[PDB]
Amino acid sequence: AAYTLQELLTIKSDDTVGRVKVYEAIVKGENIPEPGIPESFKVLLKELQSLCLNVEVLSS
Amino acid sequence: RMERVVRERMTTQDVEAITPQTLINIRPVVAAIKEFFGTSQLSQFMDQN
Amino acid sequence: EDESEALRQARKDAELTASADSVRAYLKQIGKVALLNAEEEVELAKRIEAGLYATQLMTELSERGEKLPAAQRRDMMWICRDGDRAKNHLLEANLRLVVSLAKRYTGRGMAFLDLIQEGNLGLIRAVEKFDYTKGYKFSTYATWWIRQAITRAMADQARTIRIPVHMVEVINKLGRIQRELLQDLGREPTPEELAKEMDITPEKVLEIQQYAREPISLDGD
Amino acid sequence: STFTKLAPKQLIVDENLYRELVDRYGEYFTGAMGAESIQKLIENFDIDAEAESLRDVIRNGKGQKKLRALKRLKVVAAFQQSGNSPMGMVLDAVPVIPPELRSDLNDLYRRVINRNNRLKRLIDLGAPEIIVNNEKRMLQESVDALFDNGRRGRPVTGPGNR
Amino acid sequence: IFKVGDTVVYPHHGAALVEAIETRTIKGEQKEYLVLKVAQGDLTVRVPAENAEYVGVRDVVGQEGLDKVFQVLRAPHTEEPTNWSRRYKANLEKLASGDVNKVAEVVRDLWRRDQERGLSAGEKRMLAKARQILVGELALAESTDDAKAETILDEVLAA
Amino acid sequence: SLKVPHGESGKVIGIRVFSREDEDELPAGVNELVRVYVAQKRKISDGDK
Amino acid sequence: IVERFGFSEIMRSTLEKDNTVGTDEALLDIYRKLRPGEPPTKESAQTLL
Amino acid sequence: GSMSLSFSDPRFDDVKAPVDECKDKDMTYAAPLFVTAEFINNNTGEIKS
Amino acid sequence: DRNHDLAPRQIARYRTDNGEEFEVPFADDAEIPGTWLCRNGMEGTLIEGDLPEPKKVKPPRTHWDMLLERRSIEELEELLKERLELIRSRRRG
Amino acid sequence: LDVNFFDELRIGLATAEDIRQWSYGEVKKPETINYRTLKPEKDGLFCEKIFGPTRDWECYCGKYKRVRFKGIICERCGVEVTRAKVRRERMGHIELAAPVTHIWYFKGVPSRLGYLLDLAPKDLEKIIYFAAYVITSVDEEMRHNELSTLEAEMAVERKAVEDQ
RNA sequence: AGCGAGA
């Protein structure tokens, strides 16, 4: 069960932009939007960068 | 701690101008007892269930 | 002594030094140079002043000056380097003064090595502004300057939010008086009592209290 | 005899001998102390020659010597194959985590900045080698504590002795 | 030299009421122990009477010193070293000497100063302590209702 | 304003108004500390142990 | 040592293996091992123990 | 060793307030503690208590 | 966050000590300084030739300057003479 | 911001150039916030000129305060007027007066610096904590020629010390 | 941060 996991860990917990969006979708009755990137991954990125560890997310 | 404070200040205590009352600083003792009875592990919040 | 095994003990103590701890390392490092006496202090001063004057005059003569002769110039540059040498000798000699006096301020605010360094800064200033012609021992004067430097440092780089020195002194004064009034009364004086004692308003008393607050670990409700 | 077999990357304890060498041998070697010494050591360090020499040693030499040589070859090859130079190990600038950390960690940063500023002032005024050297060591320790407190030496402690 | 009831002057305790005496064999010798409770500190000093005079025991002063403190209070033309610290040290040593004249000079000079401007809290504490000891000494010099000693001090300072 | 936390209800047994205005020994900064005592009579039901 | 401790064989064993003669030498070795980094002396060793 | 300080005769005054009041107004049910100090000067000879 | 319209901003390059282009997004029409602080650690200055001439301040203090405020030239010259002749005696006598 | 285009993630050593490229400023003062007005300081550890405005859409002094001023920098205080959440995104950097070595590559056994330079761990530590000097360059052929000259000069010095 | 407790 993969989609429910992603839902849980992203838009139920962390994703600061999706969260208001799912609330809006529920209130208004629209399809739940697509999940974004959880806000904890970016704090990790900033902390690793802060350790002089150049961490980059290549597109492809 | 209090005795350490006293012993330290004795080098700078002018002779004959000193009395115990001005010589003894009680604050460390009261601080120690307070920080004991509050936040010491063996001073536990009473359990009156 | 001619005790080669005791010689070996001392030689281990100084040759393959463990250098375990920072303060231990610095403390053993500062004992290398011996102390000096008043005639040494004044001669050393005269040396640094002469070197500084030589540097000034050569700065002046570098511009539209004169091509000084080889022997005189080499001697005068020797004097210029000797001036800085003398300043270094004095500073290394009195690092022990710095450490002795900064000892008295440990345990509150900040680390120890920071206090030692700020005292080193106070004493570099003191030697910068030291006069022998008035014929006073150096330690007298340098003590006051180090004390000022350490107190200024404690004012600035001690709390997460620097409080200005006059504010620091008045709040410290309030702390001392309330301590004394606890001794003389046995109860924490009310803000009104402190205000009347200080000839200020209780509003300022409470404002001092609020400003004395410091953030605690973040690791109402 | 120290000279007649002298070559670099060679430590010298008991700085008395060092200052003797410098005053007598001001030229013919440059001796450094601290992180910038390591920076210079890495500057005069060609990865390809050392990697080739180590590979030759492993291919022809055997025993414990080979085993150490293999250990180093791991990291040396790691730097060769990748485009990252070993300059990254020595730091000229320390990044500042954005202001959300908000003051346990912040205080460490304050310590670093205090010591850096004091060092800058000490170099500017002109200070004895001893004081400025000690200040540099303090800056090193502060950055150490910031990236990892307690790894080397006693951990930097805060209020409440923690 | 010692009489029960006499407030012997000995600094910084100043005048101290003497109770009794103890011939005790401390150190293998029964030499006398004059006991004196100083109400100012509310503490008892059982000083060996043998060395009580040695340390500087003295009785209360007469009226010659009384008039003298008045004349000194009216003494003009006092100048101090420019730097504040050295003058503070000088007047602090003058107090630490224990001489009534020196403390009177310090108190009156510091009052005219702080009346002119109002200097600081440390000097306020110094003035408070010095004035307290002086007014106690004067009140017991005349046995004159220590509050009334405060008032006569307030009047004579007017000059 | 002080509001009943979620999931609580009952009678107001006692209210204590310790105020700096009343010259109570309030900690430095608070001017008026009020404690309200709410009591509830809990009866047995599913889930109770 | 033989008088008090000689009865056991381990004590004789460690006596011979000690290869260390002189009270000054024993106190020297201990002081060297207890507070190293400081200059050994034959005055501040008895005080140490 | 020129001067010494000593303590003796610990004693307790009456509690500053009764149990229920101490419980009510947060104040700690405590009593004053008194010790008779004694300061001695060896050079001249005095005892201040 | 509307992106179809907003108060436009102009961009002006500020050359640094190490010559770093720094196009500063300031209001489309607004006054700007000759030199602007940047992440380079210092302040870069507009490339086009203008110069308000910052007129940097004198150095706050110097050991020589501070010495002049407690001594005079003559005694320092005398000490210089003494040191010189002592050294000359050391070299040639 | 970020999208699903995360096909590859890369980690590597960050050189000083990269560090000062990331930074939006250079903190140079150990001041968090004013004790009285409770606002971030200039060039402090919370400087609004570097990490952005504390409350969204206004500069420090307040010359610009609304959304149409998006992406603008106020000349008076230099605060870039934008969203406040960017304070979780922007980094600073401290330009160290002297170089320092990153601990991870120093103390983590095996000491990767030590293996790279073939320096024994205790030795390396004594170097980088200012306890023992290290050479970094030496001479070769002219070394031979002045070694003969230096053999003569040490013959002279040895003869002098033997004479005393 | 520290205490005590349920499964």
Ligand SMILES: [Zn+2]
């Ligand atoms: Zn603005």
